Write a protein that binds this ligand. Structure first.
Ligand SMILES: [Zn+2]
Lengths: 7, 572, 571, 7
């Protein structure tokens, strides 16, 4: 939530 | 049923029970018996009695000659390395000392020594002791240089391709280019004598190096050059290595059609010749899981990594760098798979094991920690985001801060400022800053990551889309820069549908970000115009959730050799 | 945006507000205005002002000539029947009385009345008043069989194909065969005078008449004969009807390859000409959901029936037999889909609504109550098992005991003892007696159910195998006849594998029975195997139900007419 | 669920 997955 | 055991096993247990008295005469036994006596000592838990003999190069060289039970020898050797005895260092030192001694001898003893070094260094590289396998391979390469004959010129290329493999897994990329230049030196002088040497393995090692170094543009060129050199007479290990490395390099170039066939053929070859419980098959499974983790296939990527880890947890049971690599690869895949659920207990456990192994066997200033401590940090913030306690959130966010900055320093020292992995750590730091309520420099981190991602990898790319998605999420949620998040969200979705269509996993997050963006700037006629698109995405993921398990996706005999290679070559 | 009303619509409201003074002059308006004045009376809720004019045949014949607004007339008419005025009975009787007064008149008027009787009787047949549409068509047929002119036999069959449709939906099958025999009397005589009338709609009715009596071998005989007469120049309504009935007859013959191409074409063919909010399109969906429920495509079968009901709940008002048939079909599918879950609240509401409509409009001794009472009784016996109260369990089973035996008598009286529906009611009594602690009666019902299903249908069939598993479950779980349940469980699975493969949802109740079969007698090696097979069935079951909804499965223009028929005929 | 659905 609130963002996408970390690179 | 109580089937009586054979006289072989009965005498094995009787000789072991009288090992101390007859330890000298066991060393004169045939090769197949000696391994069984030694594996019985390992099974009986007598590692310290067994480690007294594996530390001798002559005894271990005869143990290595039993290639049928190498899966048992790897587990035994890993048990000894965890037992507290540094067998790998002792064997490499003994081999190097003996080579320095017998360098000034005839070519027959040097041939025997190079064969012993080949099997021993190949075992240590298969076991994961790359720092302890360079010494063996450097000794073999040194033995190749005293005489400039045809066979030494031929085997110097073998020493320089195995020396390149134990320097990409050890993250000695600065020495890798020098090793490859030396390899070209011997290869060119061999080609001058009207005898070309096949360059598939060496160019595959360059592919692995430049993908790890994140020189994707040149890694693709070198995997093309590698697969132009795949023949039918090559060993299956070399072919599998080239195919899996080219599959890894085709993913980062964003050509997700040929890489499917390459990794399928590689997994089929690994499961055919070697088996389902072989470390090489586990390596192919890790690369296949990398493929699935990249293109939206998370639910099977986590399954293949579990299959890959279970192979390495048996062949290399204990603190090994291969088990650590499997753990850190699986932890990121479980991070992605459980990202929607937000529950990270298996993923954090596997991420901690990866760091718990690497910090034990490798120095604290080594590059493989950068790929490990980052992954755990990605979990630690996501646990901190998904927890209610303020003190726990603050402590875990600070821990993730330490891990991200340490990983960024490792990547900056190894690769440099302008590289893909440094931008990965910059984007992770930006997400973490957005999580720690420090929005001022999160934006600086995000543009810093984007200006390196879109420069090296092109303006339109997967990771550029992911970073601009993070930037848009930072803008439209709390920073309240609503006039800038719209174009970034459009860029994210445009890049996502360019390669993965409307089935991309991040589309849900960027659509919810668009809903939040449009719920505060008017334009209420578009909130539901994107909500129904979100519903379409939800039903698309519901329909696409049921896919056959990736383990049997390769099936049996899907294609044949010298056919997938040719299709890949002509598809350019 | 506050768009002003049209002067037409504004003048509708002014005339309707002065209806009583000008009720005589509205009858002399153009048909497009006259329907709109009458539709506004319904919208205003003045059903008594509106219903006092629809009771007149001449006035209703004028509002039947507005063909585009039939979706509103079908909704005003249904609201009138629910309102308490018997306009369908009056118009059928007013036409028949007026029709009998021109028997000695000239053939010019005698052909105008048949035109009136086809748009009126065809409306009542479309609206679901089969007992009243039959009275209209019998008067139209009487007009055709007085003067023996060349055109009259061309229309006497056209009555006898619609007179046969209003008797199939009314379950007058014993008059249905007499109608088809009467149809060939004018069909043969017309063929003598150099004119082969198209036997496509007439033969399609027997594809529904004989399917209703479960003469599947006889129905498929006329299924082929119907589609051999399909021509591209035929009306789409005639063509769509044959494809639905052919699909219904093909599925019950345990052949699915030929059935899917017919109904999916029919769903598209009805959605193209008619639309997505037409009674005929909803008729295809119920026949399309008949395919999906039988071929175990159950997850999307509920949506098709729900889509069919939503069309009929809008066009056909509150209490209609077409809404009721959609309710009793959706309730059974919701029973089947939610059988694994065990929750029956939407399914029972639909099943209770279907009987609440049929009992209101049809007599209590009518055959359509057999299917509606059966569907609710299957739901009632499964609610009481899932709940924990013993008093409720001993009452709902007896409440479901009333319905099955009431349903069985309706099937036994009409279809006879030796028929699939009668045997299919025995199998439900087999389930019923098992759950009522009367174990010995459940066996003799299942044996009687199989010996009839096995006889007419054959050895390998969907219906017979589905009841073997119930008999196998009876011999296994409670009466401890483990020596006989072993062959029955394998027999049910073998037939299920033959027609459905490993994707059949009833294998879970068969594999779980096999696990219980060996845990009380021995041979624990097969328990691990069958648990693995149950495990193998479990993840294979989660591979195909996630396909998209069947409404868009037909897509747009997948195939063409006069080609689906040929593809079906060659195979 | 000791049996199958109703026919
Ligand atoms: Zn020791």
């Amino acid at each position: 939530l609130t963002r996408n997955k970390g690179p | 049923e109580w089937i009586p055991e054979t006289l072989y096993n009965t005498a094995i247990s009787a000789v072991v029970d009288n090992y101390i008295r007859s330890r000298r005469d066991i060393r004169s036994l045939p090769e197949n018996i000696q391994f069984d006596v030694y594996y019985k000592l390992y099974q009986q838990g007598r590692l310290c009695q067994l480690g007294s003999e594996f530390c001798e190069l002559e005894v271990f060289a005869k143990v290595l000659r039993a290639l049928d039970k190498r899966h048992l020898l790897h587990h035994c050797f890993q048990a000894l390395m965890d037992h507290g005895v540094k067998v790998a260092s002792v064997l490499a030192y003994s081999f190097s000392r003996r080579c320095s001694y017998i360098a000034e001898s005839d070519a027959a003893v040097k041939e025997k020594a190079i064969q012993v070094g080949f099997v021993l260094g190949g075992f240590l590289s298969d076991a994961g002791w790359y720092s302890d396998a360079e010494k063996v391979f450097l000794s073999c390469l040194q033995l190749c240089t005293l005489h400039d004959e045809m066979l030494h010129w031929f085997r110097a290329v073998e020493c320089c391709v195995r020396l390149l493999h134990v320097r990409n897994g050890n993250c000695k990329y600065h020495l890798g280019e020098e090793t490859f230049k030396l390899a070209q030196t011997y290869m060119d002088k061999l080609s001058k004598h009207g005898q070309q040497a096949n360059k598939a393995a060496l160019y595959g090692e360059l592919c692995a190096l430049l993908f790890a170094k994140s020189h994707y543009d040149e890694a693709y060129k070198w995997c093309i050059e590698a697969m132009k050199e795949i023949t039918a007479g090559l060993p299956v290990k070399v072919v599998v290595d080239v195919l899996r490395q080219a599959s890894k390099a085709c993913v980062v170039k964003r050509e997700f059609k040929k890489a499917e066939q390459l990794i399928k053929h590689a997994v089929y070859l690994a499961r055919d010749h070697f088996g389902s419980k072989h470390p090489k098959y586990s390596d192919t499974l890790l690369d296949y899981g990398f493929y699935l983790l990249n293109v939206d296939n998370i639910c099977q990527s986590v399954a293949i990594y579990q299959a890959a880890l279970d192979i390495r947890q048996s062949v290399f049971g204990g603190k090994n760098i291969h088990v650590a690599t499997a753990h850190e690869d699986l932890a990121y895949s479980s991070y992605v798979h459980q990202y929607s659920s937000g529950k990270f207990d298996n993923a954090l456990f596997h991420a901690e094991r990866a760091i718990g192994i690497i910090t034990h066997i490798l120095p604290e200033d080594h590059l493989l920690l950068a790929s490990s401590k980052r992954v755990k940090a990605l979990i630690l913030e996501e646990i901190a985001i998904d927890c209610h306690n303020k003190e726990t959130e603050q402590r875990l966010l600070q821990e993730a801060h330490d891990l991200h900055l340490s990983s960024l320093q490792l990547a900056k020292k190894a690769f440099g400022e302008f590289n893909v992995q440094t931008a990965k750590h910059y984007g992770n730091l930006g997400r973490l800053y957005q999580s720690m309520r420090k929005f001022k420099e999160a934006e600086e981190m995000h543009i810093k990551a984007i200006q390196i991602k879109e420069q090296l990898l092109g303006q339109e790319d997967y990771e550029v889309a992911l970073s601009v998605g993070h930037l848009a999420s930072l803008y439209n949620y709390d920073m309240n820069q609503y006039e800038n998040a719209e174009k970034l969200y459009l860029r994210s979705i445009a890049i996502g549908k360019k390669l993965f269509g409307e089935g991309y996993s991040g589309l849900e997050y960027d659509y919810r970000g668009l809903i939040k963006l449009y719920n505060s700037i008017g334009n209420y006629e578009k909130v539901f115009e994107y909500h129904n698109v979100l519903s379409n995405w939800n039903r698309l993921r519901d329909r696409q959730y049921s896919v056959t398990d990736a383990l049997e996706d390769v099936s049996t005999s899907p294609q044949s050799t010298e056919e997938v290679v040719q299709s890949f070559l002509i598809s350019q």
